[PDB]
Amino acid sequence: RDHYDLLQRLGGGTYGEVFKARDKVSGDLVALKMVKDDVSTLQKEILILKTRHANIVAYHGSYLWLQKLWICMEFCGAGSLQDIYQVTGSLSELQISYVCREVLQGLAYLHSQKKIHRDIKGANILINDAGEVRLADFRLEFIGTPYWMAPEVAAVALKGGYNELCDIWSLGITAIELAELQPPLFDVHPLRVLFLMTKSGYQPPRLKEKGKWSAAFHNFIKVTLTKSPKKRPSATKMLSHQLVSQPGLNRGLILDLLDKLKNP
Template sequence: MFTLPTGPQDQLLDEDQHEQPVTVGRSLKFENPYEDYKILKCIGVGAFGKVHKARNLKTGHLVAIKIQDCTNDNLMDLLQECMLQERFNHQNIPKVMDKYYWEQKLYICMELCEGGDLDNIYMSTGSLKESQIAFVAKEVLETLLYLNQKGYVHRDIKPNNILLTDAGEVRLVDFGLMSRIQKEKPEFIVGTPAYMAPESVLEDLSGDYDERCDVWSLGITLLELAEGKLPLVLTSSNSLYEYWEQKQRVPHLRKRDKWSPAFHRFLKDALTLDPAMRPSVELLLQHEFVRNVEHEPSPLKRCLRRSKFLGSIRKFF
């Protein structure tokens, strides 16, 4: 039978506190979450579990609830990810309101991002405009800079992990693959192959496997939003290794005249093959492509309205 201890001995490693343990039982609720929340509908499904839109029965507020099956092997990893998200304090990282452990499932209640993820949005509306892409770039870079300053690298930047609120604000999610910044090649290859930096699988490139891997992933993400499709269709780390070992061409924008020279230069910098020569997150935030981005109102609000309009038409027919 599967059980979770709740006493002082039940502790997780808190790397931000110089590897001092912290107790997890204090804020984790061991009670039925359905007594506090009403599930309205499923809004996302993935390897992590399901995400539901729900209403707080006491306040009436709408939230998102991620429900994950727990085993002896994965519970502490799931809690560690949740605790990381709770500890981060940045406007682009969804706030965690509650977490429950009930009937061998972990329920994480957090800020609802009604707009959905960028993957579904661009597949609904088509490729984004340059002003919208620049907005995404700056918001994600600012979030990555915050994480880097805390000593972390995200390692899974992609459109699926970039959500939008109803106001068109960017939220970065999924911290399951996050790790401490390190100056050596990790023991295990992690990430989504189509977005992974070349140095994550190749050993013969100069430089370190550090936070600049997120810069590459962001470059691939922006290229996808501009072209309306993935620039590299790779399904495994082996196929990624073969692609770069054969010295294939670095992805780039196909329609040169459609985009500004600043966007071309930004992608060229972000998709620098040698990580030692690739700009840092902090340096890219000074790039002309994102330097003068307008934040209010969000340039993505129109995109969201179009996505909802097209969605309602499809339901009608």
């Protein structure tokens, strides 16, 4: 409050209470997230956030003022991939490929720290001005969006049991999302989507157009969208997949996309 100047509410309830702020001593842009009772318990949860990955939005500081918690993070100028594709349209196969590798690297770190993101979706993958892909590491708000749920997460509403492998399924849905501007079954009732997953003969989703994509992209979708969690590969195993281990994958693919965002 006394060090930063608030400028713009970001998310519109999607993120919660996020603010685009400017430092009075640096002038640099930051993201301030306000979280809705004890003093000693609050200072313990912050210390663990400073100990930091290339594909994770970096922590800056925390502020406990008048019953409000101010989580400070880095500002990704372009916003989320969803904000980007609402202007640029669908991403190229190589753009999606690079985005998947970067998300998979962030998930490898998160899952190694015994954490589960649980919300991997287009609107939760941020792209900074530098063309870098970053995820966010954080009675409470139920985390999860029906269309991006793994079958073991949807079924959890009857016969519980899920693990870090759900983020692999969510990344699979997000790959289809970045290609078709909508997840599979976006047009179908969320209970019906999460009900058809719980029935026999269930077929995991694929890209609508077969001819528009390569067999490696089609295999990445087949492999990440494995119905069985036991057979679904780990984030590190996925990193060696033909699609995300291609040689042309560089940050420039996103500097191209960010240029289309500026002037299409």
